[PDB]
Structure formats: C-alpha cells, structure tokens
Amino acid sequence: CDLRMGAGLCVDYSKSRRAHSSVSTGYRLTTFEPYTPMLVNDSVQSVD
C-alpha cells in the first residue's frame, strides 16, 4: 500500500484492504499438522 486511506483501506484504482503476513501462519499451521520426531521429521524431510 501507498495511498493509505482510512482504517484498513488502501487505494490503487480500487478500495482494497491492508494486509499482513498472518495469512502465511494459518497456512503453515494447518499445512504441517503432523508432529512425530521420527516419522514426520522424515516425511517432511522428503517434502522439504
């Protein structure tokens, strides 16, 4: 955002909203639900 205008809003050509990185936490949080030091560590190792 550049032309910030009023709480939560920003103008480009449209009345867009202001964003933050919280969205990437919801992603990581729900993406990596498994948590076993052996099985998941290795399953994730393959993913990584």
Binding site: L29, F32, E33, P34, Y35
Partner: protein, 49 residues
C-alpha cells in the same frame, strides 16, 4: 511447534515453569495448581474492570 503436537495450555504453562528448574515433581500437583491459579486470576481480572 507444540500447537501441532497438541500441548494443552496448562501443559505449555508447565513447560514455561520447567524453564525455572521446577517440574511436576517439585510443584504441588501441577494440573490442579496451574489450572486453578490461572482460572482464579482470570476471574479476578474480569471482575477488576
């Protein structure tokens, strides 16, 4: 990290307490101490307003 594992809040409190060098074998029964210490505080906090 612990959220994925599913550590309940009172357990995460124990983990923070473990950081003091104090464990459930040092504490009075920790499930009751932690649960009631926090719930009593929360009660008081809301009433404080």
């Amino acid at each position: 990290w612990s959220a994925a594992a599913g550590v309940p809040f009172s357990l995460s409190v124990q983990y923070r307490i473990n950081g003091l060098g104090v464990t459930m074998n040092v504490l009075s029964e920790n499930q009751k101490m932690i649960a009631s210490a926090f719930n009593n505080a929360l009660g008081a906090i809301q009433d404080g307003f």
